[PDB]
Design a protein around this ligand. Structure first.
Ligand SMILES: Nc1ncnc2c1ncn2[C@@H]1O[C@H](COP(=O)(O)OP(=O)(O)OP(=O)(O)O)[C@@H](O)[C@H]1O
Ligand SMILES: Nc1ncnc2c1ncn2[C@@H]1O[C@H](COP(=O)(O)OP(=O)(O)OP(=O)(O)O)[C@@H](O)[C@H]1O
Ligand SMILES: Nc1ncnc2c1ncn2[C@@H]1O[C@H](COP(=O)(O)OP(=O)(O)O)[C@@H](O)[C@H]1O
Ligand SMILES: [Mg+2]
Ligand SMILES: [Mg+2]
Lengths: 502, 315
């Protein structure tokens, strides 16, 4: 027909919203029922809500749907806003008096409905009057579309007003496979596509794509092939797109609800060496937790707190575990992203991020510098109370409909939090200690290729009686290692710096 | 930039209106962070020289009239922040060599793209002068300093926006260096309350840990005199190393400074040291106090008897 994917969410719509219009009026009057006059659809944007309405309109041979934009109506002047509403139904009013019950169906679409409630009342009253009051008109069907259903007032959901409500979800593997066929039918049917392009393999690569992104991918793949000949030149007889074109195209479209790999890779991780058994144990436990998440139904929410001395290396283990997981959705809420925003802006941003996190089979959230987000200072102490309750509630809430996410946050003020009485939110705690032995320093120096063994042993010999009880984290040690490499006397500088740091 | 020069000067070349002694290759290297409009302005100014006269020197003189963005704030750094430099002790040389090593490390490493150092000590030691002197010898294209003088008479909201905009501009050149002066005064600290602004502190705390994008790098220097206050607000985990600047406590350094400042003949320079030997052998004063007391003594009728009195008072 023209729509792929959604199969079970279309039969139900056709059963209720349109099944009655087919039958002759005689039997309908015999039954003693009335036609439904409202319908609501909600879901994430760019998923194909208008397409199904347009395509189901053609089967009934109805008039071409009109369209209205909520923000457009609200933005115009008040008088024109009041006047234009009566204009939409003019044709339905005329044809009704013209013919009577034997008239044809007219369908109207309304977009961004929730904008009217987000603050307007005149348009809502006029809409309800035409479909419920003594001015009832028996030839129209109104469809409303919104991205946030909880904001629509409950008064509109009672019988006689928007009786039927439906939800649209992101496509499954089968949905992506079917939409690809729907898009490439024309190329396939006229022999302009190579024989090496395999769609079953393409379906898996695009993970959290929506339909629009798949269409854009096809467009870019066609553009790749087209550009290869220009610079217009008559050679167009053997033009055939190939797999390599689509593989190159994949690196061109970055989707929403996708992996923010750049932040994970660049800023956070720039070196990783296993100098002790505890690091291996921590990584093994992290991998075990990941596999627990992947193959269990009883655990859908896990939150962890990694704590240790300042500069221990907390942020590196989290990102290292996250990257190897291979999840489709990964994101971080950090002071960098929240910098420069107002308090209410921060509340809205956190709420929106959490709402977005509830729209993927698997997710990861990294909250950076938990104590800094609340803007705590020990002098007062001072803090913003409103943000604290939001964060406290959000850390326990579960995602809906068999979805799962993992939240991880880092802090160095364990005493402040335990005093604040929010330690009941975190399911488990992990402690990452600092180095306390010289044999660990030997491995650290070895794996970074600081210099030859002859000078390597001398540093240990000197530190053996310089200061045997040093206590320094990985960051400072690795910074001193590099800052001693650009000097005339590496040994003395390294020894002095490491002793001073301790 | 060479191709931009070629495009701009093609019209001049094509009509034999350009001298043969001008080489575009050297100009492509002298202009380090210029843009197309900057090159257009430079060419226009150079041609103005030739027009007014009725060459290479024309462009060299035009280079002195156009100042680009992302350039060097030469006047602010050179004049106010540096008014003398003398090696009175070994510690100064050690600090300078460490600073040079760090500057070279930042330029010749991939792992280190963000280095922060903290310079603290008793008031009047000379921290700010060292901070600017280290940056001046680096030669990086981009240099800026944030001091209270810029933010005087501003509101808090404008202050945050200004600092954030400066840090945003910092991420658009291959190399950058930033200087922060008198951290405690920027935050409006008074101990009775204590009173201060928390939003600016949090913004600075977040900024100091961020890393630049796309294999870019920058260096940060900060000067302070309230180490204990910074300890109270637990922001000591941001800086990866510290340097201490003590005051003077020996008469040999005083003699060296006196010799360097051209006080007077050795006869009186010996007498001053002999008097201070048993006047107060345990004095402790900074460089700023001494370099002003020496200035004061010179214009007096009895410099020897006045400098000793000033040293006694300061101690
Ligand atoms: N095994 C390791 N574990 C942790 N950090 C490591 C390791 N190997 C190398 N590093 C280096 O340690 C440096 C310190 O990491 P990072 O800055 O994330 O630590 P931190 O203690 O969370 O810091 P912050 O003081 O900002 O809270 C990183 O640049 C990383 O390059
Ligand atoms: N080796 C030196 N190091 C520092 N300053 C020196 C040195 N030799 C001479 N001076 C002079 O010391 C004077 C005082 O230094 P400077 O102006 O940097 O003060 P400061 O430490 O920034 O002051 P304040 O603590 O009041 O902010 C400078 O004018 C400089 O001319
Ligand atoms: N299942 C699907 N099959 C083919 N195309 C789809 C599908 N879902 C969405 N699209 C594409 O989405 C576009 C229209 O989506 P849109 O009108 O923006 O819906 P909504 O506004 O409800 O997100 C069309 O160009 C269509 O090709
Ligand atoms: Mg971190
Ligand atoms: Mg100062």
């Amino acid at each position: 027909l023209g729509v792929g994917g959604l199969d079970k969410e279309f039969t139900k719509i056709f059963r209720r919203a349109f099944a009655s219009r087919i039958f002759p009026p005689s039997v309908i009057e015999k039954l003693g029922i009335s036609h439904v006059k409202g319908l609501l659809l909600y879901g994430p944007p760019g998923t194909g809500k208008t397409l199904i309405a347009r395509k189901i309109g053609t089967m009934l041979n109805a008039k071409e749907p009109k369209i209205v934009n909520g923000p457009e109506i609200l933005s115009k002047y008040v008088g024109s806003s009041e006047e234009n509403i009566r204009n939409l139904f003019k044709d339905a009013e005329a044809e009704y008096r013209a013919k009577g019950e034997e008239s044809s169906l007219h369908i109207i679409i309304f977009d961004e409905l929730d904008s009217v409630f987000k603050q307007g009342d005149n348009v809502v009253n006029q809409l309800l009057a035409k479909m419920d009051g003594v001015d009832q008109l028996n030839n129209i069907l109104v469809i409303g579309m919104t991205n946030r259903k909880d904001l629509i007032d409950s008064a509109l959901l009672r019988p006689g007003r928007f009786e039927v409500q439906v939800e649209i979800h992101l496509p499954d593997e089968k949905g992506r496979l079917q939409i690809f066929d729907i898009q490439t039918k024309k190329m396939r049917e006229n022999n302009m596509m190579s024989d090496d392009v395999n769609l079953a393999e393409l379906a898996a690569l695009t993970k959290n794509f929506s339909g629009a992104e798949i269409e854009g991918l096809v467009k870019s793949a066609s553009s790749f092939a087209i550009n290869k000949t220009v610079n217009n030149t008559k050679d167009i007889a053997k033009l055939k797109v190939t797999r390599e074109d689509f593989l190159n195209a994949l690196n061109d479209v970055t989707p929403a609800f996708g992996i923010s790999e750049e932040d994970l890779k660049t800023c956070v991780e720039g070196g990783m060496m296993l100098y002790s058994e505890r690091v291996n144990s921590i990584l093994k436990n992290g991998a075990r937790y990941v596999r627990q998440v992947r193959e269990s139904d009883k655990s859908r929410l896990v939150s962890l707190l990694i704590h240790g001395p300042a500069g221990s290396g907390k942020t590196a283990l989290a990102a290292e575990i996250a990257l190897k997981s291979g999840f489709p959705f990964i994101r971080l809420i950090s002071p960098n992203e929240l910098s420069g925003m107002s308090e209410s802006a921060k509340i809205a941003y956190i709420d929106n991020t959490f709402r977005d996190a509830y729209k993927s089979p698997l997710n990861i959230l990294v909250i950076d510098s938990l104590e800094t987000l609340v803007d705590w200072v020990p002098i007062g102490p001072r803090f913003s109370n409103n943000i604290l309750q939001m964060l406290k509630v959000a850390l326990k809430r579960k995602p809906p409909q068999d979805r799962r996410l993992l939240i991880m946050t880092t802090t160095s003020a364990y005493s402040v939090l335990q005093q604040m009485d929010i330690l009941s939110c975190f399911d488990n705690e992990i402690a990452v200690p600092n180095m306390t032995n010289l044999d660990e320093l030997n491995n650290v120096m070895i794996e970074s290729n600081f210099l030859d063994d002859a000078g390597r042993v001398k540093v240990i010999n000197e530190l053996s009686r310089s200061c045997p009880n040093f206590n320094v984290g990985i960051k400072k040690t690795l910074t001193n290692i590099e800052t001693a490499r650009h000097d005339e006397d590496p040994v003395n500088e390294l020894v002095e710096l490491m002793t001073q740091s301790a």
